[PDB]
Amino acid sequence: PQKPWWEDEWEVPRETLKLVERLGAGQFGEVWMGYYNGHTKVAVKSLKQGSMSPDAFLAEANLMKQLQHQRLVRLYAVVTQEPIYIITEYMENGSLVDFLKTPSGIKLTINKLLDMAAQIAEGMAFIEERNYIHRDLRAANILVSDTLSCKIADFGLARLIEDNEYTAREGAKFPIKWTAPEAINYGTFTIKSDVWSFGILLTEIVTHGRIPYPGMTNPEVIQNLERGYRMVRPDNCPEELYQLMRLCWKERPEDRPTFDYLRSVLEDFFTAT
Ligand SMILES: COc1ccc(N(C(=O)Oc2c(C)cccc2C)c2ccnc(Nc3cc(OC)c(OCCCN4CCN(C)CC4)c(OC)c3)n2)c(OC)c1
Secondary structure: OOOOOOOOOOEOOHHHEEEEEEEEEOOOEEEEEEEEOOOEEEEEEEEOOOOOOHHHHHHHHHHHHHOOOOOEOOEEEEEOOOOOEEEEEOOOOOEHHHHOOOHHHHOOOHHHHHHHHHHHHHHHHHHHHOOEEOOOOOHHHEEEOOOOOEEEOOOOOOEEOOOOOEEOOOOOOOOOOOOOHHHHHHOEEOHHHHHHHHHHHHHHHHOOOOOOOOOOOHHHHHHHHHOOOOOOOOOOOOHHHHHHHHHHOOOOHHHOOOHHHHHHHHHHHHHHO
């Protein structure tokens, strides 16, 4: 189990926090931009009581206590006496999917998009090496800093893997366009499932946040994939990159490359441009 709150180094008195601006509001709670001890800017997630189990809520906080890296949004603190809060490192420019649509994002050069792509792969390489999987890898869950660097966020579905794979529930449902076939079909996820999602994420980067598989419904996406087709070349997408995306979408999970490999290639692509 976890150390008791009176011993957990992560526990902080609720008095230390002040919620300032609401970033998101959902069925299970809200997320706010706030301040820790006045001067430190942070993000605070609050649990809407009754919406879900506190155990269920704090589970991702506990995983984040275990998974730490410069490229992953860092757990800052936790308040475990109701109401419950999960506090994290703050990212000024929000989600990558949103940032890419702003005046600043629209002007990003392909070189910078490749840089960011490599930054993301760098973080996944760490997750990969530590025997974890994300399962929710998408531009929506990549946050951007004030210095235009990227970090992986939302470890809600993230899981420590005991021996290569994790099996989800038969009732658990996932985003069709972002999830690997084997995961949608048998609920089985592996780091290779994340590699597939990364491919999809790449299309999000080069299209400045467009929804993958343009003009296609989910039934259509699934049917086309089974025929051997893959997403159509996005407008204005370097061919080298399109081909890297294809590696991420190979039929056999084992045939897809590692995240470290993806990182190296993207870094070469970046240094070139
Ligand atoms: C669902 O919203 C989300 C809200 C917050 C977070 N989140 C986080 O880590 O949440 C979290 C915590 C704290 C603990 C456990 C698990 C999770 C997910 C988080 C953590 C650190 N920085 C930021 N900055 C941010 C600044 C910003 O702005 C400064 C912004 O934009 C908000 C406004 C965007 N909207 C876009 C559409 N329209 C223009 C209205 C504004 C952002 O939006 C993405 C984000 N967000 C999400 O991370 C996935 C999604």
